[PDB]
Nucleic acid binder design. Sequence first.
DNA 1: AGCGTCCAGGTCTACC
DNA 2: GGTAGACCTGGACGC
Length: 316
Amino acid sequence: GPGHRTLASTPALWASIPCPRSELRLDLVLPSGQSFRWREQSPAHWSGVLADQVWTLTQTEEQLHCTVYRGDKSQASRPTPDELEAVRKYFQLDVTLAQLYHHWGSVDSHFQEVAQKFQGVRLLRQDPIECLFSFICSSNNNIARITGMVERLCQAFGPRLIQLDDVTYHGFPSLQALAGPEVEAHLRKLGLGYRARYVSASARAILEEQGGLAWLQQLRESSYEEAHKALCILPGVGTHVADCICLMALDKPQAVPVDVHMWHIAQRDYSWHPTTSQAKGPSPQTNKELGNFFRSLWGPYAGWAQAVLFSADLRQ
DNA sequence: AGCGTCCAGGTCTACC
DNA sequence: GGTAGACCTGGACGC
Ligand SMILES: [Mg+2]
Ligand code: NA
């Protein structure tokens, strides 16, 4: 297919959004386990599917530059203002990250130290269905393997969009495409392990028991506590996966995922231990208490502070 | 030399 | 509700 674009080579095809590097670092966000579907196909340029089309993104010191491949056999052109608005919404640029970093650092000297080296880590606003099934794939697993799982799931069950160079881009599958009893066996062939059943059973539960796709919008409109409880009915969704979906797709900025990294960060970097349980190791009660500890420390956007520490912990 | 253990964005099941 | 251990997969890497 046609080439993945670079800004300096094809300037007529790009348009900018005001966005300083203090507000966003693509290299610290897009490969860090929020979305699994972006790749640095040219140095400093990240390509992936965003609002149903492929985009490439790159940045200068003060701007986020964007290019879109419409794949409808139309003539190439720069993104329009209306298309750029989808990118601005995906990066939630109405939230001023530099102010949150100052708040978090004022209450937490450890955060302040890490933040100095990890500027521009913000939270993507993701599609609920993509986020749900990506995080079902994430449990007891590592980011490189999760990334492959998600790519193979999309290639097998999602619509083909376009090919750039030798990369064929697919959209994320629908609920219906993931729900049939033949799907688990295919996802097992694709190496999803025991999560193959969780993916297909969760798609069937949403369609057959929760009222279909509108349930995810209902959870976006519900409180954090209500949304988190509701997601936990799904096979493969426990309190951590539910917190990931709440934070990253359901607009719950105080949701704090607690995985292996955040548990070890609490112990190593905060000397924290639970005080609501005599036994101190990970457990439902202690993982719950740890989420509450980080909310109490960082405030109503505690999940966003978690994303900074998580991204940094991947690099150490 | 390469096997085998540890480990990774945890959840489920069984049992008390 | 608390506790404990199994669990698909494959890269890191000690022995
Ligand atoms: Mg569940
Ligand atoms: Na609903």
